[PDB]
Design a protein around this ligand. Sequence first.
Ligand SMILES: Nc1ncnc2c1ncn2[C@@H]1O[C@H](COP(=O)(O)OP(=O)(O)O)[C@@H](O)[C@H]1O
Ligand SMILES: [Mg+2]
Lengths: 167, 637
Amino acid sequence: KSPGDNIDFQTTILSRFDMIFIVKDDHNEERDISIANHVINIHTGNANAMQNQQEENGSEISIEKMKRYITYCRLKCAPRLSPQAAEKLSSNFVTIRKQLLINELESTERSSIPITIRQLEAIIRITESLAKLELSPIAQERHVDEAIRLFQASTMDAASQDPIGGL
Amino acid sequence: PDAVFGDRVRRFQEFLDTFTSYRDSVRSIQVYNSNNAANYNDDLNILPHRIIISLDDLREFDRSFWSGILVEPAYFIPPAEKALTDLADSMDDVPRHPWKLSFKGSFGAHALSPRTLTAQHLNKLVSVEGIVTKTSLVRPKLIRSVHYAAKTGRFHYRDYTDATTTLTTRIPTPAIYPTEDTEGNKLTTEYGYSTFIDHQRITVQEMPEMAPAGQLPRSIDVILDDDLVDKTKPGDRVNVVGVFKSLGAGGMNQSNSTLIGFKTLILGNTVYPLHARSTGVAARQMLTDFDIRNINKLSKKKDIFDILSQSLAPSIYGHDHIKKAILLMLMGGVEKNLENGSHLRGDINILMVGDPSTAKSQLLRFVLNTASLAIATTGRGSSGVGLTAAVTTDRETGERRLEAGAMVLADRGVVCIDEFDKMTDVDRVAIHEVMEQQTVTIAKAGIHTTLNARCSVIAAANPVFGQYDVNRDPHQNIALPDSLLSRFDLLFVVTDDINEIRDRSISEHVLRTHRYLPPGYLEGEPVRERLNLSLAVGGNYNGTEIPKLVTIPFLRKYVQYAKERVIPQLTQEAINVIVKNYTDLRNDDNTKKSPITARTLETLIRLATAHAKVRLSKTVNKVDAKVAANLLRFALL
Ligand SMILES: Nc1ncnc2c1ncn2[C@@H]1O[C@H](COP(=O)(O)OP(=O)(O)O)[C@@H](O)[C@H]1O
Ligand SMILES: [Mg+2]
């Protein structure tokens, strides 16, 4: 079935969202063994000791520290895109819609999942968020590349699951 | 006589002597009243006796007297009113009611809200912003009663006072109504010689925009007098400047013995109706002579229609004819009222339908922000009672009374309806009357009324398949009744067609918009939001003072001036054009998105009239008719 066939609502609602995630039950033994082991470590208390040791190590932070950091980042920083990073965004945004254009002309049917100007503003928002991560007043190309990586991992694989959006 | 009272009278006299603006404002009021009196004598309106006083200028003059008015107004306001009355009587010697005072300017810590008002602000001049919820009946209060004694044939009188008129409290002396004089003769009341002053009380609670979202709101009572009654209606956003007073004894008498406490209410000196987003107060602004000269300079240009339309929403690429339609709707056309009571529409209704993410809701929000009396409504959120009107019961009178819905409150304004396709059938039948007959007819239990609902309507719809299909017929795509499509003057189908060059242009425009910084802001600093409250009187960023494109605040001045000043009339050169276009369009063979009825001719007339209003022209010309026809032909084809 199409991704819009699985949802019990209009396909425009998917376009209202900035990023979509299709969560899959892959059903692999080497994966469910690991998941079950992780849940056992949750239940015994080994995960509690591991997380405390990792917080003391310095590669995880507390939830209250995260809350205060989120408040500080939202109240202090609001980045702006650099002029050199806009060309990459425009080019890699127009290539996707060119691919969807040729897919729609070949298939002669509208794709159930769309990508619009709202998705371009979504990728802009992701780039500005990644720039706001390090309290950076300006967004560089390394934020743009990572934002595009998240967009490919989130909305574009969902579009590829749509066989109108694939091909 | 009090020494400090006289000293404060002299100090305010010196302040009024320093600032001549209040003096010749008094003189202007007096000469206006005298001119109206002379016109009534030879062959009307009367101005109230009060003066707007800027507190900032007073702080510049005398800080002690300014802080005296703000902190202890009961000792400082009556001397200032006495000094103003003496000055006004001094200028009235060559050509009776005492003059009052109104306060404007920054209040500092005294600019409060009904939640923020506590008893430390009692007996102080406070400015309170909020929303009017209850407005009591304007009742006459008897000040002086005049009586006639027929045995002696003499006219007696008695004066009555209460605690709400004077700021400083005095001894309450209850003088009863005199029905017999000293010698015992019968007194007959002479109505028409007695003096009655209008009195109102309103309830102002905090506005829901800055009220806390969880808990109950707080409200205060405001007492208004003869020149301040009927300045408000429920639902208005107001700023009331007045003395936060306490009255009576809080149960400390033996007869009173309860814990209502000391009753607290504001003796209102000034009422400002402020314009907020999607409220019942129309946005009005002062037009200076420089602005009128600039508007007249733009009226003579030949590309003015292409300048005002493209300068509406420069952050939205394309949709130029939609901008033109929105501008012509904001012009509003001209309505006709005949001698037999018939009414002909002037307002223009615009419907836009098409693919998602095509800047429809952003255009709706723009028209909400840029129109004088635009009110926003969604599809399923509002119902039949919320749109037209509803009936409740008054607590005091005990009878039924009316609540004006979204469409009635936007009289002479714009109704911005988003998600038009999801509205209920009863809503559609209710709005069939409003879009054409321009009224709301209420026939409920005991209430049969007709409310004026003269509005312009913008609607944004969505095709039932989610995306517009080119090969399909438009009747199946729109999926709306034919009557509703006939009500709308213009219907615009927007298609999100993909083209590489066009998508490059859209992406470049969006990124250039996303590389914007406000003036006076740093690179990393987030832009702060201040809630927009305006007083109601009576892709290039650097658009400032008509350089290439008109800025939004000047565009509102242009729209306001074109609405109040120019009322164009039709001429035969435009008439032949519109008749030819209408009779051609009725007999065209090509399939149109909108069906063609006799309403299309009136849409042509309204669009021509609106384009004439753009040109600031007393008449409708042939080019206006051509523009009106060519704008409608795009919406039809
Ligand atoms: N032609 C356009 N020019 C600029 N921005 C656009 C355009 N079309 C859509 N957008 C952007 O897409 C976003 C989606 O909102 P909107 O398009 O108003 O939704 P809808 O079309 O469903 O009303 C908006 O933030 C707007 O900035
Ligand atoms: Mg929308």
